[PDB]
Scaffold this active site. Structure first.
Site, mmCIF file in Angstrom:
data_model
loop_
_atom_site.group_PDB
_atom_site.id
_atom_site.type_symbol
_atom_site.label_atom_id
_atom_site.label_comp_id
_atom_site.label_asym_id
_atom_site.label_seq_id
_atom_site.Cartn_x
_atom_site.Cartn_y
_atom_site.Cartn_z
ATOM 1 N N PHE A 60 1.022 -1.323 -0.163
ATOM 2 C CA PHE A 60 -0.417 -0.040 0.097
ATOM 3 C C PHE A 60 1.052 1.316 -0.161
ATOM 4 C CE2 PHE A 60 -4.606 -2.166 1.033
ATOM 5 C CZ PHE A 60 -4.298 -3.177 0.764
ATOM 6 N N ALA A 61 0.672 1.998 -1.158
ATOM 7 C CA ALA A 61 1.060 3.520 -1.631
ATOM 8 C C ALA A 61 -0.319 4.485 -0.847
ATOM 9 C CB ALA A 61 2.474 3.372 -2.252
ATOM 10 N N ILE A 62 -0.103 5.089 -0.063
ATOM 11 C CA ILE A 62 -1.313 5.895 -0.035
ATOM 12 C C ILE A 62 -0.504 7.270 0.625
ATOM 13 C CG2 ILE A 62 -3.938 6.298 1.265
ATOM 14 C CD1 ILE A 62 -3.400 4.307 -0.883
ATOM 15 N N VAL A 147 5.269 -0.569 2.513
ATOM 16 C CA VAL A 147 6.187 -0.086 1.963
ATOM 17 C C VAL A 147 7.462 0.770 1.751
ATOM 18 C CG1 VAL A 147 4.823 2.117 1.160
ATOM 19 C CG2 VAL A 147 5.486 1.489 -0.345
ATOM 20 N N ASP A 148 7.268 1.685 3.415
ATOM 21 C CA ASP A 148 8.214 2.123 3.404
ATOM 22 C C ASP A 148 10.177 1.300 4.139
ATOM 23 O OD1 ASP A 148 7.086 0.945 5.920
ATOM 24 O OD2 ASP A 148 7.863 2.795 7.234
ATOM 25 N N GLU A 238 -1.857 -4.881 13.318
ATOM 26 C CA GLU A 238 -0.910 -5.259 14.612
ATOM 27 C C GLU A 238 -0.925 -6.453 15.221
ATOM 28 O OE1 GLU A 238 3.170 -4.258 16.038
ATOM 29 O OE2 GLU A 238 4.017 -4.362 13.860
HETATM 30 O O1 LIG Z 1 -0.324 7.488 5.221
HETATM 31 C C1 LIG Z 1 -0.294 6.812 4.871
HETATM 32 C C2 LIG Z 1 -0.229 5.369 6.583
HETATM 33 C C3 LIG Z 1 1.116 4.117 6.199
HETATM 34 N N1 LIG Z 1 0.248 3.867 4.838
HETATM 35 C C4 LIG Z 1 0.512 1.973 4.659
HETATM 36 O O2 LIG Z 1 0.736 1.567 5.460
HETATM 37 C C5 LIG Z 1 1.968 0.903 5.861
HETATM 38 C C6 LIG Z 1 1.808 0.776 7.698
HETATM 39 O O3 LIG Z 1 2.479 2.452 8.460
HETATM 40 P P1 LIG Z 1 4.042 2.810 8.420
HETATM 41 O O4 LIG Z 1 4.418 2.531 7.526
HETATM 42 O O5 LIG Z 1 3.559 4.229 8.396
HETATM 43 O O6 LIG Z 1 3.953 1.745 9.825
HETATM 44 P P2 LIG Z 1 5.396 2.195 10.748
HETATM 45 O O7 LIG Z 1 6.581 1.131 10.167
HETATM 46 O O8 LIG Z 1 5.850 3.568 11.396
HETATM 47 O O9 LIG Z 1 4.681 1.806 12.359
HETATM 48 C C7 LIG Z 1 2.616 1.788 5.520
HETATM 49 O O10 LIG Z 1 3.813 1.103 4.930
HETATM 50 C C8 LIG Z 1 2.600 1.735 4.468
HETATM 51 O O11 LIG Z 1 2.337 1.202 3.674
HETATM 52 C C9 LIG Z 1 0.973 4.673 3.447
HETATM 53 O O12 LIG Z 1 0.533 3.954 2.677
HETATM 54 N N2 LIG Z 1 -0.262 5.704 4.089
HETATM 55 O O1 LIG Z 2 5.862 -2.727 19.577
HETATM 56 C C1 LIG Z 2 5.033 -2.196 18.719
HETATM 57 C C2 LIG Z 2 5.489 -0.726 17.618
HETATM 58 O O2 LIG Z 2 6.856 -1.074 17.889
HETATM 59 C C3 LIG Z 2 7.787 -0.326 16.831
HETATM 60 O O3 LIG Z 2 8.684 -0.290 16.888
HETATM 61 C C4 LIG Z 2 7.309 -0.171 15.491
HETATM 62 O O4 LIG Z 2 7.498 0.944 15.153
HETATM 63 C C5 LIG Z 2 5.821 -0.151 15.433
HETATM 64 O O5 LIG Z 2 5.059 0.349 14.092
HETATM 65 C C6 LIG Z 2 4.735 -1.314 16.135
HETATM 66 O O6 LIG Z 2 5.914 -2.454 15.495
HETATM 67 MN MN LIG Z 3 6.499 0.789 8.372
#
Ligand SMILES: O=c1ccn([C@@H]2O[C@H](COP(=O)(O)OP(=O)(O)O)[C@@H](O)[C@H]2O)c(=O)[nH]1
Ligand SMILES: OC[C@H]1O[C@@H](O)[C@H](O)[C@@H](O)[C@H]1O
Ligand SMILES: [Mn+2]
Ligand SMILES: O=c1ccn([C@@H]2O[C@H](COP(=O)(O)OP(=O)(O)O)[C@@H](O)[C@H]2O)c(=O)[nH]1
Ligand SMILES: OC[C@H]1O[C@@H](O)[C@H](O)[C@@H](O)[C@H]1O
Ligand SMILES: [Mn+2]
Lengths: 282, 282
Positions: A60-62, A147-148, A238
């Protein structure tokens, strides 16, 4: 039906030498935990190619996260299931912002337009994944990732199995009471302090299409219940993934090689390879 | 469809402690190698009972080998899949010599009369196993064992998988060139000196009914070819089983806990349990 492997010359496995002595390589329900040194990729490649396996990869890339697609996809091309059939499914609110990435033979990309949400973006992936008939017709396995991220090394058919989760890189050495599971009994994601095998990362799970449909259906139904009851799990999808995988044990577990953050966690000796890694972001 | 496990309280698996460091616990194609300390039988029992699993056990008792059935069956009752549905299939030329053994609830025994052969008795098991429609209707898994044996300890659902073989107790520490595979290129069972993973024992293999039908069909077809060509493999059906499992990798491998000979090999420290053992004979 599975045809015979051809003759192959490779090192004999020796029963009285483990390769890996430093880590747990099998779960107590007899699922392999996938680390470097545990698999012969030549044998696995043969097995999966003999089945003409097709792997789908969802991302997902939103909104602003479209910026991450070029590196994601270009490095997927270098490292993800190379030699196998791959179908990328890019879910986006900005189809025109999807970069034009050159693909290797036997690989395709589809852009699926979705609505953008104003937590909900992350949480709605389960619903959006559970495009059901399409996947059943087009791929054998689904891999569902953030995606990141970037691929830095081999991510291949050693992951494929009916149902897999990935060890969260912040928790693989933690005791279960430290896990950040949802702890409120009012949530469908609740897990008591004396339960839990692992803390799985929401950013990398998969399996057969049937098992992935089951999982994403169950997690989306559980999130709807929570919604109706006015509760949002601490870590959103999650948390629900973790509850699912506690009650439906995965058939493989991926080591943190497969979801790492080098800026936050460095490169420990227990990680021989850093395969799929976080890209620095705000 | 697999319903949810119930809540269970058990020790957390720790990723940075392996239980077993002394032995290889996963093959290079990511099949578990089943040793004591690698499995939580409570979790596996739950999983298999939730599926109402039925295990069939095949045993041939031809000519004088009927004498081995009482101990075989009585100890199977104490140790083999207790709590699960079990269907024993006793293949014999002397139906009236089958001992009357009291079975636990949910367990049944059928006596299947066959002809006695004058090597051929051992070799014809594959043909005789491949009762095909019957097994598909009556059991989920087939386990195929020698009769001149006794159960001494737990043999349970940790073995069940689409296709398994058992490490031969004389060869688990051997290099592949020492394995007694068929070495003549004129035999369908031929394996060159630089091929081979393990030396599997002909006296304990199994799997799903579909995979066991595939195996026994393939081995019976290969033995027929050898026959036509005037060649008998050095170790008969075991040679053919070994060729099959080289080309069709098993999804679990059982450790020598599961086929041992204490008179010939003692009780090494690497064996925590001696589960299924040879009975002394002429
Ligand atoms: O504005 C947003 C927020 C999240 N995502 C999608 O949701 C995933 C989970 O969010 P994120 O990677 O920000 O969670 P993090 O790894 O920072 O906790 C992202 O990789 C993207 O794939 C997106 O596409 N747009
Ligand atoms: O404790 C759970 C959390 O741990 C962070 O490191 C991660 O960025 C979050 O997305 C979540 O998985
Ligand atoms: Mn992420
Ligand atoms: O006269 C015979 C010879 C063999 N068998 C069956 O074939 C299996 C393989 O033979 P055996 O156990 O004699 O092989 P070994 O383990 O001595 O090499 C036996 O366990 C029996 O199940 C039999 O029933 N009657
Ligand atoms: O070398 C192979 C042989 O090894 C013996 O120990 C066993 O009795 C035989 O049946 C055969 O398996
Ligand atoms: Mn025997």
């Amino acid at each position: 039906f599975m045809v015979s492997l051809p003759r192959m010359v490779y090192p004999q496995p020796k029963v009285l030498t483990p390769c890996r002595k430093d880590v747990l390589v099998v779960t107590p329900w007899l699922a392999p935990i996938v680390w470097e040194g545990t698999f012969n990729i030549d044998i696995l490649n043969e097995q999966f190619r003999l089945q003409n396996t097709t792997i789908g990869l969802t991302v997902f890339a939103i909104k602003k996260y479209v910026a991450f697609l070029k590196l994601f996809l270009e490095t997927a091309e270098k490292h993800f299931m190379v030699g196998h059939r791959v179908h990328y499914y890019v879910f986006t609110d900005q189809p025109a912002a999807v970069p034009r990435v050159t693909l290797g033979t036997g690989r395709q990309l589809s852009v699926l337009e979705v609505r953008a949400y104003k937590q909900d973006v992350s949480m709605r992936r389960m619903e959006m994944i559970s495009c059901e008939r399409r996947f059943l017709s087009e791929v054998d396995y689904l891999v569902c990732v953030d995606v990141d991220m970037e691929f830095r090394d081999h991510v291949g058919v050693e992951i494929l199995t009916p149902l897999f989760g990935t060890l969260h890189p912040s928790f693989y050495g933690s005791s279960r009471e430290a896990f950040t599971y949802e702890r409120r009994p009012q949530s469908q994601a609740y897990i008591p302090k004396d339960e839990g095998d692992f803390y799985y990362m929401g950013g990398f799970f998969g399996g057969s299409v049937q098992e992935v449909q089951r999982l994403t259906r169950a997690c989306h139904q559980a999130m709807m219940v929570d919604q109706a009851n006015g509760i949002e799990a601490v870590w959103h999808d999650e948390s629900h993934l973790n509850k699912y995988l506690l009650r439906h044990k995965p058939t493989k577990v991926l080591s943190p090689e497969y979801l790492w953050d080098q800026q936050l966690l460095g490169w420990p000796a227990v990680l021989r390879k850093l395969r799929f890694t976080a890209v620095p972001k705000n």
